[PDB]
Structure 1
Amino acid sequence: AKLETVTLGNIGKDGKQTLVLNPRGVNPTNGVASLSQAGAVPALEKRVTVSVSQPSRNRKNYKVQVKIQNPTACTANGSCDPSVTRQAYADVTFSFTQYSTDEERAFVRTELAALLASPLLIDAIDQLNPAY
């Protein structure tokens, strides 16, 4: 549907964190939409990117790419302006076949989320731990 303000509740380890994302427009070249938090400095502002794709002579498969960019502001650099320090990269992709059905895709969508809420990944993500 239409790019809109996207509010998000239940965020962060607390789950009391909330975030809104304004539509940033769409880069027509790569054909990729953009979403962002409204901050002060766009360089500091959180970014969310989604894209679709269509099969070509190069590839017969659909690609759905989602990337998230969350920098780390250094408030006091010893200078009057904050500066980017660390840049968190969150990337998600999807592949499908021209005959892919709806529920299959839908099935993929939820389960990925459930994993993200699974106690497995949290140690993997938060504490950077392998499967043991």
Structure 2
Amino acid sequence: AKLETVTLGNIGKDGKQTLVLNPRGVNPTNGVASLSQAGAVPALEKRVTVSVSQPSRKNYKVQVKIQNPTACTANGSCDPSVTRQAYADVTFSFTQYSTDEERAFVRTELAALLASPLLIDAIDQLNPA
């Protein structure tokens, strides 16, 4: 669709957060759209980069990269810097004949594991299975 201010709601371990993402245009060299938090220091922005790569491999590759840096202001300078860069990547794939449901069943599945008690115990605490 058209890039708009995605108001991601109810995020965070407690589930009471917000995250607005202003659009940031489509980098035309690789078709990678981008979003970003309104945080007005553009090396400390929660970035989100969606994209779709049409067959050139014969498979659509919806690829959502998000990226959350953390700012460690304290001691010795004034402008905060980037200490930890907590990436996160999602690279779907779909054969040319992938129906409408066989896709929206991989989306909501991966959108349901990431809230199931198997992953919030395998990401929020890095406990393996």
For this structure pair, what is the TM-score category when the shorter chain's length is used for normalisation? over 0.9
- Between 1:71-80 and 1:26-35, the stretch displaced more is 71-80
Greater share of strand: 1
Contact 1:77 1:83 in 2 (8 A): no
Contact 1:73 1:85 in 2 (8 A): yes
SS for the counterpart of 1:124 is: coil
**Structure 2 unpaired stretches of 5+:** none
Distance (Å, rounded) in 2 between the aligned partners of 1:98 and 1:41: 41
Q: Which runs of 4+ in 1 moved over 6 A?
A: none
Distance (Å, rounded) in 1 between the aligned partners of 2:75 and 2:120: 32
Q: How far does residue 40 in structure 1 lie from its aligned partner after superposition?
A: 2.1
Q: How far does residue 14 in structure 1 lie from its aligned partner after superposition?
A: 1.1
Distance (Å, rounded) in 2 between the aligned partners of 1:77 and 1:32: 36
How many residues align structurally? 129
Distance (Å, rounded) in 2 between the aligned partners of 1:48 and 1:73: 18
Distance (Å, rounded) in 2 between the aligned partners of 1:74 and 1:8: 25
Report the counterpart of residue 33 of structure 1 in structure 2.
Answer: 33
Q: How far does residue 76 in structure 1 lie from its aligned partner after superposition?
A: 1.7
- Between 1:92-101 and 1:68-77, the stretch displaced more is 68-77
CA offsets 1:90-132 (integer angstroms, 9 cap, x no match): 000011111110000011111111101100001100110111x
Distance (Å, rounded) in 2 between the aligned partners of 1:42 and 1:77: 21
CA offsets 1:75-101 (integer angstroms, 9 cap, x no match): 223101100000011000011111110
Identity across matched positions, percent: 100
CA offsets 1:34-90 (integer angstroms, 9 cap, x no match): 00001121100110000001111xx11111111011001012231011000000110
Q: CA RMSD in A?
A: 0.8
